[PDB]
């Protein structure tokens, strides 16, 4: 029998990753947040999805029409740009940081969890960059964070951060232990 070359290559890649020993900096992912807390975090984030192209165009057209005939508060939305997120982090401006575990360039995000830990900003790792992208109207984002949550959800965000602390930062505080991937 025979199989597609790309299929064989990708299948062998999984075996190589499983069997190969990885340094402590790698494998920090896949020790992801539990299903329940991740689901709650996604539910909270869904309330702050940034305005999409269609909605923004509709709002601008409505404003133009109103002006043609003759003071809203600051917009609130999740910040997801990797460069923008990294610029917000290290400035003590971000409250919650989400990191994807399936970034194609691993080195692109190895430092982000450690940088967040050094800065003390709460952070969590969730499975799948596609899930992060879906909630921000983009294919993938690899990261997601909140900066200005509404007062109505301030308590919810604080409780979520407190829960995530124990769920991820305390359970996986030993992620630096013996190199992972040691599977027969």
């Amino acid at each position: 029998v025979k199989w597609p070359e790309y299929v064989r290559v990708q299948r062998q890649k999984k075996i190589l990753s499983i069997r190969l020993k990885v340094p402590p900096t790698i494998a920090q992912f896949q020790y992801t947040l539990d299903r329940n807390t991740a689901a709650e975090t996604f539910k909270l984030f869904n309330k702050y999805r940034p305005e999409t192209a269609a909605e923004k165009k509709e709002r601008l057209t409505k404003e133009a029409a109103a002006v043609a005939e003759g003071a809203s508060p600051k917009p609130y939305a999740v910040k997801y740009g990797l460069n923008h997120v990294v610029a917000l982090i290290e400035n003590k401006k971000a409250k919650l940081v989400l990191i994807a575990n399936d970034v194609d360039p691993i080195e692109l995000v190895v430092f982000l969890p450690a940088l967040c830990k050094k800065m003390g900003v709460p952070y969590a790792i969730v499975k799948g960059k596609a899930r992060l992208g879906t909630l921000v109207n983009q294919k993938t984002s690899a990261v997601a964070a909140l900066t200005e949550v509404r007062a109505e959800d301030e308590a919810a965000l604080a409780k979520l951060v407190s829960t995530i602390d124990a769920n991820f930062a305390d359970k996986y505080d030993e992620v630096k232990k013996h190199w992972g991937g040691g599977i027969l």
């Binding site: 062998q12 075996i15 190589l16 069997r19």
Partner: protein, 69 residues
């Protein structure tokens, strides 16, 4: 082959011990994927053992030879 070269280099005082330390389808690639000395290569190889104008020109050349010889 390089093992013999390293052993030969270690035989003389050029370097010593201190200087030395100063899936199947994947292991196959790993196995298949430094300077060498001619003396070591030779040692390992040995160890592996179990007309008108023409006549005028000729006359002129003969005259020249007779004058100079």
């Amino acid at each position: 082959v390089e093992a013999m070269t390293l052993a030969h280099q270690l035989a003389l005082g050029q370097k010593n011990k201190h200087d030395l330390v100063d899936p199947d389808w994947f292991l196959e690639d790993e196995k298949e994927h430094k300077p060498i000395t001619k003396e070591a290569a030779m040692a390992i190889k040995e160890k592996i053992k179990a007309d008108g104008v023409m006549k005028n020109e000729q006359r002129a050349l003969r005259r020249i030879a007779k004058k100079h010889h």
